Design a protein around this ligand. Structure first.
Ligand SMILES: *[C@@H]1O[C@H](CO)[C@@H](O)[C@H](O)[C@H]1NC(C)=O
Ligand SMILES: *[C@@H]1O[C@H](CO)[C@@H](O)[C@H](O)[C@H]1NC(C)=O
Lengths: 438, 438
């Protein structure tokens, strides 16, 4: 049989339900969302890391001429200079009365440390959510893991179970992101082929070990200015360390709902938000006919004591009369309250307690023992402790915090002035007629 | 200097422009979009291809019992059968008075041909356009290739040139696509992990040579029914050949604007649609002062004959007086008409012809020889031939097909009834006063 139900997106929050079929005892169904797995689609754009300038041996043409030539190396620079003043420990490298000239050039390349200090700029889209569900029926536990989509049931025992789509779409990830040393940072990285000195991603490459590179970081050559042969180079500070210094806090400290983000899939997990509708198919053989089910008689409830606690602290008791030994389930069709155990033994005239929780102080509701129903009411008090991180609000508040006494007082407050005005008008018209008599 | 201009998205359509700077002769600028390259971002989802069922040797337990066991193989099936009737050329394989039983099982695997018959399902997004521009200035040709974005100028001579963004976004590709044997097909492939017998992508795999596979194609075992040992298997027809038979026409025959689609990048090229704004930076040294530019005097135009042809078939002539020898550019600031050659020699009293085209039959406009301007008018006739595929409408029609004679007739048609009614009212009030005299 197939049953439909909506569940909150949250871990460690079992949800209990029942299936009604004529001649079959209502079957307890427990559903647990073990964890969440939001995996988006992303594409590798480029990589960046601290670079190193190249300072190759300059070219010296003595007492003659020469011309500059470009080079395919990324961020390359070249420039000639006449009237050079070459000196070295060995002395004047060559000789002519200041006629000689020298060509200098430089370029950049990623340093060896980059191999492990690389930071990759990622473009992401189409967040996809994966949900793992564990379902208990007839004290039998089955499992499945399915994409949140409502069109691809998973495989578990060759059982087709579907979930979603989500009520709302949530994704902490933004279109542009960066990954560095296992830390993910939300930032609008410059597009590939865009070089801006003193900025993130100044050096860009298709792959870490790509021979072809493109970069621009405003390198300007300086004229020789000293005795010896030297190439003074002026360049802006590397942008990688710049972004490192003031990169801001990591996404791990900014993700809403406490998403637990992992890097190797670049995906979130254990993050709770939204609702999920699901349809569960259960084999008919799993069901049990009511003929063999225990029969109960003259059952009653009693709230020994309840507390309006965030955690599961509510208690209840039931007393029953029966004729057959065995087990029956227990349920509460009121969403405001949730039980703890689904089934229990049954004796001829036994009475058993129950643990439960509620989201309202007016503990009035209907609970079913085995197949039969029964009303049960009480009032609960706020707790002394008022800060706890354990599961809370298994059912969200439904403006039911208002008390029965509050309803009685509000009813006694509003007055029936409409009846007063109606009676006044009626007597007024009657008197008007009586005086039209004259 | 920097100049801004908008160009249509189309190949083989040179666009001519001028830059105005005081004391500098206007510099002809020719811009050509050599080709287009629309490259989107896509992710590999899975692969599919014709499969082959596995028919392994069945298990036979003689005169005893046995139990079925599942197998991790994709789309696996298993089933036992008692009271088997085993026979073979060698005869009754084993002996017991019908007590023996046999277990049969089967699964599926991609056939060797699949290695080259594989079809990959692709998910695509964020179409990105790449434009190659060739720019001629001062009879010097330079090139660049830039992403359509307006934030990443390209590198050519270390020159920064920017283009786009597009006026409108166009992409023949859809969210879901498939690629097979170099043919791209637009189809909503079933999501990974969704098996539907008798449909496209029945067999799915992360990679072509992935040991782990998932599939379901409704295999049911049949009981032994003959003398010999045999395993009758019933299964639905393979979905790959099914989609092949009625896959529909390829995208190559459906892409708007005649996009030329290539598979190895899964990208379109040579596809024309939309407008592109661009900014071109030109070095100051490229400009030439008006002092050295040839000086012209008393220039005049003459339309020898024009034809309202789709192709470049318009002709013109100019006669000029000058004092200096050299070259000057020629331009037309009227968008409705486009010239063919940008510059020409200049003599003291020479006269030269010109080839051009127009998008309106009213060939009235202003054209500039060297620096000076001049008005020039004529009328053009439709051509005898009225089907040609060569470049047409270098400038789109601007509701200027209306003729001067049509304007004269329309002006002579509309009448000044407003003046008539005003005069009638004035004389009416005058007469009313005259009669109020009595
Ligand atoms: C599940 O509950 C039924 C109900 O009495 C019981 O008969 C059965 O033995 C239980 N199964 C297990 C595994 O405890
Ligand atoms: C470009 O045109 C100018 C204008 O007269 C001329 O001086 C120059 O030689 C031309 N350049 C080439 C390469 O023809």
């Amino acid at each position: 049989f197939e049953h439909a139900t909506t569940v909150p997106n949250v871990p460690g929050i079992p949800y209990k339900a029942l299936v009604e079929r004529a001649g079959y005892a209502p079957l307890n169904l427990e559903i647990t969302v073990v964890s969440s797995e939001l995996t988006p689609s992303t594409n590798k754009e480029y990589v960046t890391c601290k670079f190193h300038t190249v300072v190759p041996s300059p070219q010296v043409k003595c007492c003659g001429s020469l011309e500059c030539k470009a080079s395919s190396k990324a961020d390359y620079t070249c420039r000639v200079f006449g009237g050079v003043y070459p000196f070295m420990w060995g002395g004047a490298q060559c000789f002519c009365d200041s006629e000689n000239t020298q060509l200098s050039e430089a370029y950049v390349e990623f340093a060896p440390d980059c191999t492990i200090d690389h930071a990759v700029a990622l473009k992401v889209h189409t967040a996809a959510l994966k949900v793992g569900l564990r379902i208990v029926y007839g004290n039998t536990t089955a499992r499945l893991d399915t994409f949140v989509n409502g069109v691809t049931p998973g495989s578990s025992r060759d059982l087709k179970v579907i979930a979603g789509p989500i009520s709302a779409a949530f994704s902490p990830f933004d279109h542009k992101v960066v990954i560095r040393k296992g830390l993910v940072y939300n930032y609008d990285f410059p597009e590939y082929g865009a070089m801006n000195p003193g900025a993130f991603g100044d050096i860009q490459a298709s792959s870490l070990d790509a021979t072809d590179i493109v970069a621009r970081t405003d390198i300007r050559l300086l004229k020789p200015s000293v005795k010896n042969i030297h190439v003074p180079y002026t360049q802006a500070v590397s942008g990688y360390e710049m972004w490192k210094n003031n990169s801001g806090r990591p996404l791990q400290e900014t993700a809403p709902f406490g998403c637990k983000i992992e890097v190797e899939p670049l995906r979130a997990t254990n993050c709770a938000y939204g609702h999920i509708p699901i349809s569960i198919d259960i084999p008919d053989a799993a069901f049990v006919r009511s003929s063999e089910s225990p029969t109960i008689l003259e059952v009653s409830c009693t709230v020994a004591d309840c507390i309006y606690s965030a955690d599961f602290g509510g208690s209840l008791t039931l007393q029953y009369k029966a004729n057959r030994e065995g087990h029956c389930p227990v349920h509460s069709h009121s969403t405001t309250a949730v039980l703890k155990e689904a089934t229990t033994h049954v004796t001829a005239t036994g009475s058993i307690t129950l643990h439960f929780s509620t989201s309202s102080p007016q503990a009035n509701f209907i609970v079913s023992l085995c197949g039969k129903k029964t009303t049960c009411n009480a009032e609960c008090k706020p707790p002394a402790d008022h800060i706890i991180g354990e599961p809370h609000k298994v059912d969200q508040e439904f403006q039911a915090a208002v008390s029965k006494t509050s309803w009685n007082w509000l009813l006694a407050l509003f007055g029936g002035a409409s009846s007063l005005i109606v009676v006044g008008l009626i007597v007024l018209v009657c008197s008007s007629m009586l005086i039209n008599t004259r």
